[PDB]
Design an enzyme around this catalytic site. Structure first.
Site, PDB file in Angstrom:
ATOM      1  N   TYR A   1       8.787  -2.167   4.899  1.00  0.00           N
ATOM      2  CA  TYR A   1       9.018  -2.895   6.155  1.00  0.00           C
ATOM      3  C   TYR A   1      10.013  -4.037   6.017  1.00  0.00           C
ATOM      4  O   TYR A   1      10.809  -4.296   6.931  1.00  0.00           O
ATOM      5  CB  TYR A   1       7.710  -3.522   6.664  1.00  0.00           C
ATOM      6  CG  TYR A   1       6.739  -2.498   7.159  1.00  0.00           C
ATOM      7  CD1 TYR A   1       5.836  -1.894   6.291  1.00  0.00           C
ATOM      8  CD2 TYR A   1       6.762  -2.096   8.487  1.00  0.00           C
ATOM      9  CE1 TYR A   1       4.952  -0.928   6.742  1.00  0.00           C
ATOM     10  CE2 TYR A   1       5.887  -1.134   8.942  1.00  0.00           C
ATOM     11  CZ  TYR A   1       4.985  -0.564   8.069  1.00  0.00           C
ATOM     12  OH  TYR A   1       4.135   0.389   8.551  1.00  0.00           O
TER      13      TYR A   1
ATOM     14  N   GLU B   1      -1.999   2.436   0.292  1.00  0.00           N
ATOM     15  CA  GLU B   1      -1.728   1.058  -0.157  1.00  0.00           C
ATOM     16  C   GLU B   1      -2.883   0.443  -0.951  1.00  0.00           C
ATOM     17  O   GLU B   1      -3.484  -0.560  -0.526  1.00  0.00           O
ATOM     18  CB  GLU B   1      -1.312   0.158   0.996  1.00  0.00           C
ATOM     19  CG  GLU B   1      -0.070   0.687   1.705  1.00  0.00           C
ATOM     20  CD  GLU B   1       0.433  -0.210   2.810  1.00  0.00           C
ATOM     21  OE1 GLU B   1      -0.318  -1.098   3.276  1.00  0.00           O
ATOM     22  OE2 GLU B   1       1.625  -0.046   3.185  1.00  0.00           O
TER      23      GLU B   1
ATOM     24  N   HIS C   1      -7.663   5.257   4.509  1.00  0.00           N
ATOM     25  CA  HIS C   1      -6.828   4.184   5.058  1.00  0.00           C
ATOM     26  C   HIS C   1      -7.736   3.036   5.477  1.00  0.00           C
ATOM     27  O   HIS C   1      -7.672   2.568   6.627  1.00  0.00           O
ATOM     28  CB  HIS C   1      -5.983   4.725   6.246  1.00  0.00           C
ATOM     29  CG  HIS C   1      -4.738   3.932   6.552  1.00  0.00           C
ATOM     30  ND1 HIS C   1      -3.508   4.535   6.731  1.00  0.00           N
ATOM     31  CD2 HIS C   1      -4.551   2.611   6.816  1.00  0.00           C
ATOM     32  CE1 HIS C   1      -2.616   3.620   7.071  1.00  0.00           C
ATOM     33  NE2 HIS C   1      -3.224   2.441   7.133  1.00  0.00           N
TER      34      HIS C   1
ATOM     35  N   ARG D   1       1.161  12.023  10.513  1.00  0.00           N
ATOM     36  CA  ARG D   1       0.365  11.457   9.438  1.00  0.00           C
ATOM     37  C   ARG D   1      -0.779  10.695  10.095  1.00  0.00           C
ATOM     38  O   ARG D   1      -0.554   9.758  10.871  1.00  0.00           O
ATOM     39  CB  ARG D   1       1.197  10.527   8.542  1.00  0.00           C
ATOM     40  CG  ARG D   1       0.363   9.819   7.458  1.00  0.00           C
ATOM     41  CD  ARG D   1       1.165   8.923   6.484  1.00  0.00           C
ATOM     42  NE  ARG D   1       0.225   8.203   5.610  1.00  0.00           N
ATOM     43  CZ  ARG D   1       0.140   6.873   5.498  1.00  0.00           C
ATOM     44  NH1 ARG D   1       1.001   6.066   6.120  1.00  0.00           N
ATOM     45  NH2 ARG D   1      -0.815   6.351   4.737  1.00  0.00           N
TER      46      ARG D   1
ATOM     47  N   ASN E   1       5.714   3.163   1.584  1.00  0.00           N
ATOM     48  CA  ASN E   1       5.848   2.432   2.831  1.00  0.00           C
ATOM     49  C   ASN E   1       6.788   1.265   2.569  1.00  0.00           C
ATOM     50  O   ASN E   1       6.780   0.693   1.481  1.00  0.00           O
ATOM     51  CB  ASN E   1       4.493   1.901   3.315  1.00  0.00           C
ATOM     52  CG  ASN E   1       3.490   2.995   3.589  1.00  0.00           C
ATOM     53  OD1 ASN E   1       3.820   4.178   3.669  1.00  0.00           O
ATOM     54  ND2 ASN E   1       2.235   2.592   3.755  1.00  0.00           N
TER      55      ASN E   1
ATOM     56  N   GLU F   1       5.637   5.280   5.949  1.00  0.00           N
ATOM     57  CA  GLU F   1       5.622   4.289   7.033  1.00  0.00           C
ATOM     58  C   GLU F   1       6.899   3.464   6.966  1.00  0.00           C
ATOM     59  O   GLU F   1       7.301   3.046   5.894  1.00  0.00           O
ATOM     60  CB  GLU F   1       4.461   3.289   6.893  1.00  0.00           C
ATOM     61  CG  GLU F   1       3.058   3.873   6.985  1.00  0.00           C
ATOM     62  CD  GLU F   1       1.982   2.802   6.923  1.00  0.00           C
ATOM     63  OE1 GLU F   1       2.280   1.615   7.231  1.00  0.00           O
ATOM     64  OE2 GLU F   1       0.849   3.160   6.560  1.00  0.00           O
TER      65      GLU F   1
HETATM   66  O1  GTL Z   1       1.799  -3.610   9.482  1.00  0.00           O
HETATM   67  C1  GTL Z   1       2.038  -2.341  10.036  1.00  0.00           C
HETATM   68  C2  GTL Z   1       1.385  -1.205   9.228  1.00  0.00           C
HETATM   69  N1  GTL Z   1       1.776  -1.454   7.838  1.00  0.00           N
HETATM   70  C3  GTL Z   1       0.908  -1.078   6.773  1.00  0.00           C
HETATM   71  N2  GTL Z   1       1.236  -1.384   5.519  1.00  0.00           N
HETATM   72  O2  GTL Z   1       2.316  -2.252   5.284  1.00  0.00           O
HETATM   73  C4  GTL Z   1      -0.425  -0.317   6.936  1.00  0.00           C
HETATM   74  O3  GTL Z   1      -0.459   0.911   6.247  1.00  0.00           O
HETATM   75  C5  GTL Z   1      -0.629   0.076   8.401  1.00  0.00           C
HETATM   76  O4  GTL Z   1      -2.006   0.356   8.533  1.00  0.00           O
HETATM   77  C6  GTL Z   1      -0.137  -1.006   9.401  1.00  0.00           C
HETATM   78  O5  GTL Z   1      -0.860  -2.175   9.085  1.00  0.00           O
END
Ligand code: GTL
Length: 437
Positions: free
Chosen positions: A290, A164, A119, A75, A288, A343
């Protein structure tokens, strides 16, 4: 043993401004990330994307790394101002040439390209005309997307309109922490709406231009848990910060209820006039994910509550069940036909040991746990078709600059040496085995 479906797409992800460097090479126009990072005070250490990982020159090596690792999908994003230096009108053949070589190389090597159209590196020329604040961006974005489809749609068959859009609108135009660095709530909500309109116009052009192939859109998501039995604060954070802000318009033709409670006066007066166009049919949703957050009502009437949980170098709490939740929740709420995790990854203070290796067991642990939860979601019926690690490479992490390393490949910025981390090796084995063991 947790084996994934036949043909499940294991991937890695990057973005143009974060890895490429050479932002003004070969006739490229400036982006808003160029001008934002060259403005003192905006990015930690005064870091910029001028050099980054020098992928603009080292792209063949990087793809050979993806190949060597056996990763099945890449990607990556295209820099709008490399393609159309003034945003609309003139097309730069050298910009097209750069991505053409990447695309052909991936295909030769059996790696599936997933292209993120936007992006975050908007042409500066369009920012001068208001950028995402200007309704006309639906036209500019459609024109840009049409060029990409016409040039690459013969080979690239998997497309993402926006990365995003919540971040683009809110972090860029309300918090002012990202380009173009504004703090105006009325602008930020007009950016939300125009991002939707531009996304839908692009999908419409796609149907007219690339008969085969699929298009979707990517959202940031957090796992919000309530501080007590507050439950509404969680409801609002989900609806505002997660996929519903955009998917409720796409699937249902209006913003989510609690977003309207908070933000109605900030949207255009006749914003519903645009909703039927916004419902343009999409092929997949990219999520995405995290981190998780403990959330309480607080007189946006929401604040975060710090928890004693393991955290990454970002200070983000590691909550693997969050990825399972958001996958379940998207199926339950909108039932998109396909989902990808576009992601998932973590920043840790990576060190090259005396043995020449990067022993990132913390990152292995993080990935393994989330891949495990994604596996679960699949067993319970979520149509997850792929999973993309953020990131192939340590890179420019926006306002944090180079201080945050997300790669499964370590980059020594003094030499541009790539060193595959233990997590990259571990991941390659996951891909080869089509799952965990
Ligand atoms: O923080 C890590 C990644 N996380 C992202 N979003 O949460 C972004 O798409 C990517 O460009 C990076 O910034």
């Amino acid at each position: 043993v947790k084996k994934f479906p036949e043909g499940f797409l294991w991937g890695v992800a990057t973005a143009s401004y974060q890895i490429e460097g050479s932002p003004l090479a070969d006739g490229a126009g400036m982006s808003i990330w160029h001008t934002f990072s060259h403005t003192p005070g905006n990015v930690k250490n005064g870091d910029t994307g001028d050099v980054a990982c020098d992928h603009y020159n080292r792209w063949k090596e990087d793809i050979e790394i993806i190949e060597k690792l056996g990763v099945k999908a890449y990607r990556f994003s295209i820099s709008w101002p490399r393609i159309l230096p003034e945003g609309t009108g003139r097309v730069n053949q050298k910009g097209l040439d750069f991505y053409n070589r990447i695309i052909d190389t991936l295909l030769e090597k059996g790696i599936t390209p997933f292209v993120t159209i936007y992006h975050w590196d908007l042409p500066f020329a369009l920012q001068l005309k208001g950028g995402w604040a200007n309704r006309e961006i639906a036209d500019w974005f459609a024109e840009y997307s049409r060029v990409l489809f016409e040039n690459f749609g013969d080979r690239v068959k998997n497309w993402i309109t926006l990365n995003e859009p919540w971040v683009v609108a809110i972090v860029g135009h309300l918090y002012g922490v990202h380009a173009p660095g504004m703090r105006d709530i009325y602008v930020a909500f007009r950016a939300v709406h125009n991002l939707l309109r531009a996304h839908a116009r692009a999908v419409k052009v796609f149907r007219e231009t690339v008969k085969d192939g699929k298009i979707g859109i990517v959202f940031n998501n957090g796992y919000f848990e309530p501080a007590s039995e507050d439950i509404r604060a969680v409801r609002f954070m989900h609806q505002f910060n997660n996929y519903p802000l955009f998917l409720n318009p796409i699937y249902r033709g209006d913003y989510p209820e609690l977003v309207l409670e908070f933000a109605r006066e900030y949207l255009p007066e006749n914003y519903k006039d645009d909703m039927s166009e916004i419902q343009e049919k999409i092929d997949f949703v990219g999520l995405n994910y995290y981190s998780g957050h403990l959330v309480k009502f607080d007189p946006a009437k929401v604040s975060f509550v710090e928890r004693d949980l393991p955290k990454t170098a970002m200070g983000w709490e590691i909550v693997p069940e969050g990825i399972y939740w958001i996958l379940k929740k998207v199926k339950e709420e909108y039932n998109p036909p396909e989902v990808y995790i576009t992601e998932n990854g973590a920043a840790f203070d990576d060190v090259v040991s005396e043995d020449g290796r990067v022993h990132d067991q913390n990152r292995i642990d993080y990935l393994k746990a989330h891949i495990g939860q994604a596996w679960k979601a699949i067993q319970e019926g979520v149509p997850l078709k792929g999973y993309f690690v953020w990131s192939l490479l340590d890179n420019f992490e926006w306002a944090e600059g180079y201080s945050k390393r997300f790669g499964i490949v370590y980059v020594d910025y003094s030499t541009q040496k790539r060193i595959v981390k233990d997590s990259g090796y571990w991941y390659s084995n996951v891909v080869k085995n089509n799952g965990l063991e």
